[PDB]
């Protein structure tokens, strides 16, 4: 029920670095916030919150929850 509610050691062991983790969660939060501001445009590239969400929640908390749950991946170009 706070910032620390995602345990951070799990995020590090699922990422293996700390700057990768923060930019990873930031990109996912940007995608979720762009999805919320779609206004029904139905854009395909923006995928909504994969975990359950309350009536109001910051996109970054959702992003960290999906990173912690292990149901999302990223690769370097």
């Amino acid at each position: 029920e706070g910032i620390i509610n995602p345990p951070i050691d799990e995020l590090l062991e699922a990422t293996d670095s700390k700057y990768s983790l923060v930019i990873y969660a930031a990109k996912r939060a940007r995608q979720i916030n762009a999805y919320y501001s779609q206004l029904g445009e139905g854009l395909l590239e923006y995928v909504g919150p994969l975990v359950d969400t309350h009536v109001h929640e910051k996109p970054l908390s959702i992003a960290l929850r999906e990173i912690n749950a292990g149901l999302l991946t990223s690769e370097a170009i």
Partner: protein
Amino acid sequence: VLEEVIAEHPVLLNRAPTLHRLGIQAFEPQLVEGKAIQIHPLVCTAFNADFDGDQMAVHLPLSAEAQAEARILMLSSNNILKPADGRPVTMPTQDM
């Protein structure tokens, strides 16, 4: 609405001299009465902050990247050890 908004939105507390790395730390804000910032005792010596009189500044991380770095890199519960020598710094000693 303000109580609803400030949740899960970290802010950077900062004491002015900021000699070392731990002079800027991210905290989760919480609404309190009065006109003074309530700070944790357990972190005060990280800021070198006594309560004789000591104004602290609060900056607002703004985008997703900034508050993500606040939550991950800057969180006060992740800064137990002092970077100067690796000894713990978040165990002040006056009354505890």
